[PDB]
Design a protein around this nucleic acid. Sequence first.
RNA 1: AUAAU
Lengths: 114, 111
Amino acid sequence: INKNMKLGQKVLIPVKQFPKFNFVGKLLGPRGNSLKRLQEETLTKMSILGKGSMRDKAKEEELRKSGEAKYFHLNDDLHVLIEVFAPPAEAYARMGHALEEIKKFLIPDYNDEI
Amino acid sequence: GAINKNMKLGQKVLIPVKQFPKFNFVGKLLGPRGNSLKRLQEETLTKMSILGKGSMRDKAKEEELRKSGEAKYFHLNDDLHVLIEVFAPPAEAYARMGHALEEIKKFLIPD
RNA sequence: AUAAU
Protein backbone atom coordinates (compact mmCIF):
# COMPACT_ATOMS: atom_id res chain seq x y z
CA ILE A 1 0.00 0.00 0.00
CA ASN A 2 3.11 2.27 0.45
CA LYS A 3 5.44 1.87 -2.59
CA ASN A 4 5.31 4.14 -5.64
CA MET A 5 3.51 2.59 -8.60
CA LYS A 6 3.10 3.59 -12.21
CA LEU A 7 -0.31 3.99 -13.96
CA GLY A 8 -1.01 5.04 -17.54
CA GLN A 9 -4.24 5.78 -19.33
CA LYS A 10 -4.91 6.63 -22.94
CA VAL A 11 -7.82 8.99 -23.63
CA LEU A 12 -9.04 9.03 -27.23
CA ILE A 13 -9.43 12.40 -28.90
CA PRO A 14 -12.59 12.05 -31.04
CA VAL A 15 -11.31 13.61 -34.29
CA LYS A 16 -13.38 11.30 -36.47
CA GLN A 17 -16.60 12.20 -34.73
CA PHE A 18 -15.79 15.97 -34.78
CA PRO A 19 -13.40 16.64 -37.70
CA LYS A 20 -14.08 20.40 -37.64
CA PHE A 21 -12.89 20.90 -34.07
CA ASN A 22 -9.27 21.61 -33.26
CA PHE A 23 -8.74 19.46 -30.24
CA VAL A 24 -4.93 19.86 -30.20
CA GLY A 25 -5.07 23.67 -30.18
CA LYS A 26 -7.79 23.53 -27.56
CA LEU A 27 -5.66 21.20 -25.33
CA LEU A 28 -2.45 23.19 -25.63
CA GLY A 29 -4.26 26.56 -25.40
CA PRO A 30 -3.91 30.07 -26.89
CA ARG A 31 -0.31 30.43 -25.60
CA GLY A 32 0.37 26.67 -25.94
CA ASN A 33 0.75 26.01 -22.22
CA SER A 34 -2.76 24.96 -21.05
CA LEU A 35 -1.78 21.34 -20.98
CA LYS A 36 1.34 22.21 -18.92
CA ARG A 37 -0.92 23.80 -16.29
CA LEU A 38 -3.36 20.90 -16.40
CA GLN A 39 -0.49 18.49 -15.64
CA GLU A 40 0.96 20.57 -12.82
CA GLU A 41 -2.56 20.96 -11.29
CA THR A 42 -3.36 17.24 -11.49
CA LEU A 43 0.14 16.02 -10.58
CA THR A 44 0.26 13.95 -13.75
CA LYS A 45 2.21 13.77 -16.93
CA MET A 46 0.19 14.23 -20.15
CA SER A 47 1.41 13.78 -23.71
CA ILE A 48 -0.49 14.30 -26.89
CA LEU A 49 0.29 11.31 -29.10
CA GLY A 50 -0.91 9.57 -32.25
CA LYS A 51 -1.59 10.57 -35.79
CA GLY A 52 -1.66 14.36 -36.07
CA SER A 53 0.12 14.98 -32.74
CA MET A 54 3.35 16.37 -34.25
CA ARG A 55 1.97 19.24 -36.36
CA ASP A 56 4.57 18.10 -38.95
CA LYS A 57 3.08 15.44 -41.28
CA ALA A 58 6.27 14.79 -43.20
CA LYS A 59 8.36 14.19 -40.06
CA GLU A 60 5.61 12.15 -38.48
CA GLU A 61 5.55 9.75 -41.38
CA GLU A 62 9.35 9.48 -41.25
CA LEU A 63 9.45 8.56 -37.54
CA ARG A 64 6.63 6.08 -37.97
CA LYS A 65 8.59 4.40 -40.77
CA SER A 66 11.79 4.17 -38.58
CA GLY A 67 10.24 1.53 -36.29
CA GLU A 68 11.86 3.10 -33.23
CA ALA A 69 9.85 2.21 -30.12
CA LYS A 70 9.79 5.80 -28.93
CA TYR A 71 7.45 6.47 -31.95
CA PHE A 72 5.25 3.40 -31.90
CA HIS A 73 2.53 5.72 -30.62
CA LEU A 74 2.32 7.29 -34.13
CA ASN A 75 0.64 4.16 -35.39
CA ASP A 76 -2.16 4.93 -33.03
CA ASP A 77 -5.18 7.23 -33.16
CA LEU A 78 -4.81 10.69 -31.75
CA HIS A 79 -4.83 10.60 -27.95
CA VAL A 80 -3.63 11.94 -24.63
CA LEU A 81 -1.52 9.58 -22.56
CA ILE A 82 -1.91 10.39 -18.87
CA GLU A 83 0.74 8.94 -16.60
CA VAL A 84 1.29 8.96 -12.86
CA PHE A 85 3.86 7.68 -10.44
CA ALA A 86 2.88 7.73 -6.72
CA PRO A 87 1.77 5.34 -3.93
CA PRO A 88 -1.37 3.39 -5.06
CA ALA A 89 -4.10 5.47 -3.36
CA GLU A 90 -2.58 8.77 -4.58
CA ALA A 91 -1.85 7.39 -8.05
CA TYR A 92 -5.43 6.32 -8.64
CA ALA A 93 -6.85 9.62 -7.17
CA ARG A 94 -4.58 11.70 -9.40
CA MET A 95 -5.60 9.80 -12.41
CA GLY A 96 -9.28 10.17 -11.51
CA HIS A 97 -8.87 13.93 -11.10
CA ALA A 98 -6.87 14.32 -14.37
CA LEU A 99 -9.48 12.31 -16.28
CA GLU A 100 -12.22 14.51 -14.87
CA GLU A 101 -10.37 17.74 -15.73
CA ILE A 102 -9.54 16.68 -19.21
CA LYS A 103 -13.19 15.96 -20.19
CA LYS A 104 -14.09 19.58 -20.89
CA PHE A 105 -11.23 19.79 -23.45
CA LEU A 106 -12.66 16.80 -25.38
CA ILE A 107 -16.39 17.39 -25.80
CA PRO A 108 -17.37 20.10 -28.31
CA ASP A 109 -21.17 19.33 -27.93
CA TYR A 110 -21.60 18.87 -24.13
CA ASN A 111 -25.20 19.11 -22.88
CA ASP A 112 -26.55 22.67 -22.10
CA GLU A 113 -30.32 21.90 -22.15
CA ILE A 114 -32.05 20.07 -19.35
CA GLY B 1 -10.64 4.55 -24.11
CA ALA B 2 -13.23 7.23 -24.78
CA ILE B 3 -13.79 9.34 -21.66
CA ASN B 4 -17.47 8.16 -21.34
CA LYS B 5 -17.59 4.31 -21.58
CA ASN B 6 -17.53 2.04 -18.53
CA MET B 7 -14.14 0.47 -17.88
CA LYS B 8 -12.91 -2.22 -15.54
CA LEU B 9 -10.00 -1.74 -13.06
CA GLY B 10 -8.57 -4.24 -10.58
CA GLN B 11 -5.98 -3.84 -7.89
CA LYS B 12 -4.44 -6.38 -5.58
CA VAL B 13 -3.44 -5.16 -2.08
CA LEU B 14 -1.09 -7.45 -0.17
CA ILE B 15 -2.06 -8.33 3.39
CA PRO B 16 1.22 -8.32 5.37
CA VAL B 17 0.88 -11.71 7.11
CA LYS B 18 4.61 -12.39 6.82
CA GLN B 19 5.47 -9.14 8.49
CA PHE B 20 2.81 -9.67 11.27
CA PRO B 21 2.22 -13.43 11.53
CA LYS B 22 0.34 -13.14 14.82
CA PHE B 23 -2.38 -10.82 13.57
CA ASN B 24 -5.78 -11.80 12.23
CA PHE B 25 -6.13 -9.53 9.27
CA VAL B 26 -9.00 -11.51 7.76
CA GLY B 27 -11.21 -11.22 10.88
CA LYS B 28 -10.32 -7.54 11.13
CA LEU B 29 -11.33 -6.95 7.45
CA LEU B 30 -14.60 -8.87 7.66
CA GLY B 31 -15.84 -7.82 11.05
CA PRO B 32 -19.01 -9.47 12.40
CA ARG B 33 -21.11 -11.01 9.57
CA GLY B 34 -18.68 -9.54 7.01
CA ASN B 35 -20.29 -6.10 7.51
CA SER B 36 -16.96 -4.33 7.81
CA LEU B 37 -15.86 -5.32 4.34
CA LYS B 38 -19.45 -5.05 3.07
CA ARG B 39 -19.66 -1.46 4.40
CA LEU B 40 -16.32 -0.61 3.00
CA GLN B 41 -17.39 -1.77 -0.49
CA GLU B 42 -20.74 0.03 -0.35
CA GLU B 43 -19.02 3.27 0.81
CA THR B 44 -16.31 3.12 -1.87
CA LEU B 45 -18.54 1.78 -4.66
CA THR B 46 -16.11 -1.08 -5.21
CA LYS B 47 -16.11 -4.80 -5.05
CA MET B 48 -13.60 -6.38 -2.64
CA SER B 49 -12.64 -10.05 -2.35
CA ILE B 50 -10.23 -11.56 0.10
CA LEU B 51 -8.13 -14.09 -1.80
CA GLY B 52 -4.92 -16.10 -1.45
CA LYS B 53 -3.43 -18.46 1.06
CA GLY B 54 -5.22 -17.96 4.37
CA SER B 55 -8.42 -16.53 2.80
CA MET B 56 -10.81 -19.28 3.77
CA ARG B 57 -12.33 -20.01 7.17
CA ASP B 58 -11.14 -23.58 6.95
CA LYS B 59 -7.48 -24.61 6.47
CA ALA B 60 -8.24 -28.24 5.67
CA LYS B 61 -10.72 -27.32 2.91
CA GLU B 62 -8.38 -24.67 1.56
CA GLU B 63 -5.67 -27.23 1.06
CA GLU B 64 -8.16 -29.51 -0.69
CA LEU B 65 -9.27 -26.84 -3.19
CA ARG B 66 -5.70 -25.81 -3.86
CA LYS B 67 -4.84 -29.42 -4.65
CA SER B 68 -7.85 -29.75 -7.09
CA GLY B 69 -6.19 -27.51 -9.68
CA GLU B 70 -9.52 -25.89 -10.56
CA ALA B 71 -8.85 -22.43 -11.96
CA LYS B 72 -11.35 -20.75 -9.71
CA TYR B 73 -8.99 -21.70 -6.79
CA PHE B 74 -5.65 -20.83 -8.39
CA HIS B 75 -5.72 -17.76 -6.15
CA LEU B 76 -5.03 -20.04 -3.15
CA ASN B 77 -1.47 -20.53 -4.38
CA ASP B 78 -0.98 -16.81 -4.21
CA ASP B 79 -0.18 -14.59 -1.25
CA LEU B 80 -3.01 -13.34 0.90
CA HIS B 81 -4.65 -10.25 -0.54
CA VAL B 82 -7.67 -8.10 -1.21
CA LEU B 83 -8.67 -7.76 -4.82
CA ILE B 84 -10.43 -4.42 -5.32
CA GLU B 85 -12.46 -4.14 -8.51
CA VAL B 86 -14.42 -1.34 -10.10
CA PHE B 87 -16.54 -0.87 -13.19
CA ALA B 88 -17.48 2.75 -14.11
CA PRO B 89 -16.47 5.50 -16.61
CA PRO B 90 -12.68 6.18 -16.39
CA ALA B 91 -12.66 9.27 -14.13
CA GLU B 92 -15.11 7.64 -11.65
CA ALA B 93 -13.36 4.27 -11.82
CA TYR B 94 -9.98 5.68 -10.89
CA ALA B 95 -11.48 7.96 -8.14
CA ARG B 96 -13.28 5.01 -6.58
CA MET B 97 -10.20 2.96 -6.57
CA GLY B 98 -8.12 5.76 -5.01
CA HIS B 99 -10.72 6.15 -2.25
CA ALA B 100 -10.97 2.37 -1.59
CA LEU B 101 -7.20 2.07 -1.38
CA GLU B 102 -7.07 4.91 1.12
CA GLU B 103 -9.89 3.45 3.27
CA ILE B 104 -8.44 0.00 3.34
CA LYS B 105 -5.08 1.11 4.81
CA LYS B 106 -6.29 1.26 8.41
CA PHE B 107 -7.40 -2.42 8.20
CA LEU B 108 -3.85 -3.47 7.20
CA ILE B 109 -2.20 -2.04 10.34
CA PRO B 110 -2.33 -4.39 13.35
CA ASP B 111 -4.11 -3.59 16.57
C1' A C 1 -12.55 -20.38 15.52
C1' U C 2 -15.14 -11.53 13.71
C1' A C 3 -15.88 -15.09 7.69
C1' A C 4 -18.28 -11.57 3.35
C1' U C 5 -17.58 -13.10 -1.54
